Amino acid sequence: TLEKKVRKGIESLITELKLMQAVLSKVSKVPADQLDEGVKIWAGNVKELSYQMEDIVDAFMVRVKDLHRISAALEEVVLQAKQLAELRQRYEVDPRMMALYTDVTELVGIEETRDKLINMLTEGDDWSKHPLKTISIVGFGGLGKTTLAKAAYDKIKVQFDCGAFVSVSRNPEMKKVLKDILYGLDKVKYENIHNAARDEKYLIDDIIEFLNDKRYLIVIDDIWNEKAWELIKCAFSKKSPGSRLITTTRNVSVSEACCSSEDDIYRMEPLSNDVSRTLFCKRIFSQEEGCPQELLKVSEEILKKCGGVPLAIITIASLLANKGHIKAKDEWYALLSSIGHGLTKNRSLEQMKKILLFSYYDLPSYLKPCLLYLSIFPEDREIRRARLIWRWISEGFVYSEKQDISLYELGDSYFNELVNRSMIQPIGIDDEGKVKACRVHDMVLDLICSLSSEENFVTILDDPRRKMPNSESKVRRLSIQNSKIDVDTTRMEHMRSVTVFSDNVVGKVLDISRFKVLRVLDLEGCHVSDVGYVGNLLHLRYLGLKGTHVKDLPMEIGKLQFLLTLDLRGTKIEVLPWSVVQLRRLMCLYVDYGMKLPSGIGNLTFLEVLDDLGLSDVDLDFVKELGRLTKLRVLRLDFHGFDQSMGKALEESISNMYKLDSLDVFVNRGLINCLSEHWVPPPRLCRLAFPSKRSWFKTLPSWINPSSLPLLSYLDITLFEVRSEDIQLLGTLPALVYLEIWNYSVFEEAHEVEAPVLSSGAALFPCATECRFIGIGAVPSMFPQGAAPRLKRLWFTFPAKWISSENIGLGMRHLPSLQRVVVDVIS
Amino acid sequence: ACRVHDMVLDLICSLSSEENFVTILDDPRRKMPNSESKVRRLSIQNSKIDVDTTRMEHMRSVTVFSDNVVGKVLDISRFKVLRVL
Ligand SMILES: Nc1ncnc2c1ncn2[C@@H]1O[C@H](COP(=O)(O)OP(=O)(O)OP(=O)(O)O)[C@@H](O)[C@H]1O
């Protein structure tokens, strides 16, 4: 009766939201320069309305007395929708092109990189019969990728018969690009080629016929969306030895679409600190950098933030010298402090923010929110990608309608797409075999931070800014920072997410239970233990509590039916409440082994990754429950006290799952009496690690064969003895990028390290970048250099008794960078 | 009789399943629409477990392909409107 109308209004509401997101995605494509300002006001309002409507829908869906308030909110939200509708109806050249015409004798540091590039493509010009090859140059924003190409072009030009410098935009017109290529080749025969409009085809044929029996060196720069370039490639398809191509792009994933070989892809790096200092002083100062002596420290600090981008340095140098160091120690501090909050809103600096925002506008949808989510975290720190992915999934930015996806691999794809688009620097490798953490450039950071503050996406509280937007009623995301002063909490009822960064101001001054709705709650790095009110929260999806001094967890947490993640690492809790099996949806569960897991985990069927499961004092039904839930991807094992046929039971129980890709078992000073040689492994595995070293295997497992688990790229294996046939058996494994084997008997007993011999096969190492051998003598002369084309490091034991022997006749340079190696020699 | 190319077939299958023209129950798929309310045409196939018939009241047509699961799990008589059977 009463509920029927609200149920039949919810679908109308969701359809309305779909149209609203459609139009919002449409308007956000064009840059805010060709967009009339009235439409911008309207779009902002429609965004706020979308927030309100989606909050209503989520409230209803989680809740189902509340029907009365929900219905009232429904009709009034319909009221604002209509009112805004009639209120709206009532009223109705490339910045980086000029940089190309810059003086040659102003570039600093071009010659070394330019000479390296010329000899890495012109090395075959001597005996100019090598087939044509292409060189891609990859970078982000402005790192002279275009300038360097022109510097190389202007030097080696007299030794080719043709040549053209042609550019491609974000959305090229293919006819224009090909006409430009034609016009540059000969300006006399094809003088008015831009007037003639034949088709995409006949002019490609014109190029092909014109490029008969010549060496050209055509350079094509700023290629986005490789689908564009695969049309140009058909212009260069006839064999033409002695001719080459140069390609530049800000998208690394389109470079392997070129030249088909990693050796030709030219990653290029920022300037060094010395060269950056020289360029910075050359623009501002007259002739000597030692004259001021008092803003030198400010100079190096401000130079550190740019890092090595000739762009940021050039813009800062211009802005900081209006007329000979207009002022010192005050405006330089102003520019140091203005990074992060407001430096972008300035003068003659906009000419470089367009060049940066090209990338951001190039993104598809569903990636703009993910990129903007970076504005939450502080300036200079590493962000763990797992935290990003889980926060994204809980926020709602990751979804699809394909049902063959787990929703986490999708987030990883989004992260990788952001990485390859040259917007995040990935560093480190975590235990999952993927990127550990990530960081963003400062000017990209403050740029997107201002862009987010332009709408109500994110609210940031800093001492340098000390500004709080005029409308406190409508705030969704809040990120508290070192500011522990303005902690107002009055008028945030619909509060989307909240986080605290290394601040004791949490708890004592700020209250959380006031927030009726709250999607995520991130609090890692605090030292507060009063969390018992989470039962009152109902829509909470993320609960991060890593290293938070929380003593105990409230029992009534089982009501939190909608939940996704639960991080409890680094805490002092030791027991989990029993009402955790009542909870239904989870995908990750970060629990240290010191904690005790109550029985009933078989209820949690949706689990996708479980970390550091401590198996101590467990009975068999609980052991076999683990194979019931067939959705885990990553699992971690450590134990000390059930080494029985219980081990065999769970050893065959793990095979019941088929979604695994990484595993590891931890046990100290013990043989692995769990794995039997007769057991099929999961069809998918990637890591299969074994962190403990005081444990061992009697023999190498037989089930590790090239037949099964052929996708391995990680071993971390240890065993008691060693046989010269195990290495040959292991080499036939397809990828095995990473290897690590330990000889327990050698480093525990008086065992003379023998020399295993590679009998069968020829190379056995198509790509094994890292190979580590402990307690095993691996001379570099297991095979000639054509065995492991990719091998950067090698570790082995070398007895001193083989120094006078003839079997260690090494000294040759193998194919990869096999020149920095130290061996622990034993007398 | 007539025969259809295989990839044209599944191409048509996706092109028709993007809207609610027809609905297919297959073991390799085990994929169902979240809008269990709006289903018009049913094509039951080798799948004989996911034979749900809760909320399909606007059923234009049904078909069964050499499956003994017909009837014993699914009821036809409840479909108030039916074009073809
Ligand atoms: N090594 C350098 N020394 C001095 N100035 C430089 C150097 N490299 C680039 N610049 C200046 O910085 C800007 C670099 O332009 P760049 O060639 O980076 O564009 P790009 O690499 O194609 O990047 P984008 O993706 O922005 O087009 C230009 O103003 C250029 O003159």
mmCIF file of C-alpha atoms in Angstrom, chain A residues 24 31 227 254 296 373 391 470-471 478 582 593 615 634 707 726 763 778 791-792:
data_model
loop_
_atom_site.group_PDB
_atom_site.id
_atom_site.type_symbol
_atom_site.label_atom_id
_atom_site.label_comp_id
_atom_site.label_asym_id
_atom_site.label_seq_id
_atom_site.Cartn_x
_atom_site.Cartn_y
_atom_site.Cartn_z
ATOM 1 C CA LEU A 24 27.306 15.345 -16.795
ATOM 2 C CA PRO A 31 37.462 22.296 -21.619
ATOM 3 C CA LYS A 227 43.961 3.293 -33.402
ATOM 4 C CA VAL A 254 50.781 2.810 -27.581
ATOM 5 C CA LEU A 296 69.915 29.644 -2.160
ATOM 6 C CA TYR A 373 40.441 10.787 -5.535
ATOM 7 C CA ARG A 391 38.453 2.727 -1.324
ATOM 8 C CA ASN A 470 31.307 29.090 2.434
ATOM 9 C CA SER A 471 28.606 26.373 2.424
ATOM 10 C CA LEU A 478 36.610 15.334 4.200
ATOM 11 C CA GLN A 582 26.640 -13.159 10.861
ATOM 12 C CA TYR A 593 47.897 -14.311 12.941
ATOM 13 C CA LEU A 615 46.389 -21.792 12.137
ATOM 14 C CA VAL A 634 45.564 -14.339 -2.431
ATOM 15 C CA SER A 707 52.345 -29.163 -17.464
ATOM 16 C CA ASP A 726 66.060 -30.044 -10.594
ATOM 17 C CA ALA A 763 68.562 -22.045 -23.039
ATOM 18 C CA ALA A 778 76.041 -21.301 -10.145
ATOM 19 C CA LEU A 791 68.945 -11.732 -16.448
ATOM 20 C CA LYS A 792 70.040 -8.722 -14.405
#
